[PDB]
Amino acid sequence: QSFDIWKNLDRIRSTKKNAGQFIKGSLLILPMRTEDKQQFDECMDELHKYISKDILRCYPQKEQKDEGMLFYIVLKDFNILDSCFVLSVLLAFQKRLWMAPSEKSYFRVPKNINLTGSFYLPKNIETGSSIVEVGFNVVPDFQQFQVKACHVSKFMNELSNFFSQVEFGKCEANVINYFKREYNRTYSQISLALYELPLIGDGLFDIKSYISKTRPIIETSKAQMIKHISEMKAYNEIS
C-alpha cells in the first residue's frame, strides 16, 4: 500500500479483528539515540498530542555523554494499534537524518527507506517472519527483539501479527527504573572497557614480574618449535 502512516493505520484498524482492546500489563521500552535534540522534540511533541500521556512517556537520561542523548521510549498499556503508530513514527524518524534530509514531514515516510531497529519486552511473556528474538541478550531481565528491514505497511502488518500472539504478565510498578539503571550499567561497562585500550602493557598489569614469570617458557617453546622444524625436515627429506 501507500507510504502514508494514516492509510496503513486505518487499514490495520479495519481488518485486524479486535484491533482495539489492549494487552494486559503490557510494557515495551525502546531506547533510541539522536545527535540533535531540537529535531527530535518536534516529532515527539506531535507524537505526544495523538497518544495519551499515561500510555507513552519519554525518560531522558542524565546526559552523561553530553553529545548523544539517550532517550528511553516507554509504551505502557498500549493497544494493538498504538504500538504500530509509535513504532512506525519513531523507527522512521531516527533514520530520516541519514537518508532523506530534505523531505521533512514527520508522519509521511518516503519510499527509499526501510524500518530497522530494536525494542525490549519483559521476559515474563508467553508467545502462545519479520520480527525475531535474539540469542545472547545482554540486559539481565529483558528480551531484546529485532525488526529487520521492512516497508512501512509490512511493518504495521507484522507488528499486529506479533502483538496478537503475545501475552504479558505482572511486572512491578517501577520496572522502568530497573531498566534505566541496568542499561546504564551495561554501557558504562563497555565505555570503561574502551578506556583500558591504551593501558594494557604496564598500565595496570605489573609487567615487570609477568615477563620474568613467562620468559623461560616462551624460551623452551621456541626451542621446541625449532626442534619440530628440524624433525619435520628430516621426515620429509628423501635423502
Partner: peptide, 9 residues
C-alpha cells in the same frame, strides 16, 4: 543462525 543483534551483543 542469522541472529545479527545477537552477534552484535
Amino acid at each position: 543462525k542469522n541472529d545479527l543483534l545477537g552477534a552484535k551483543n
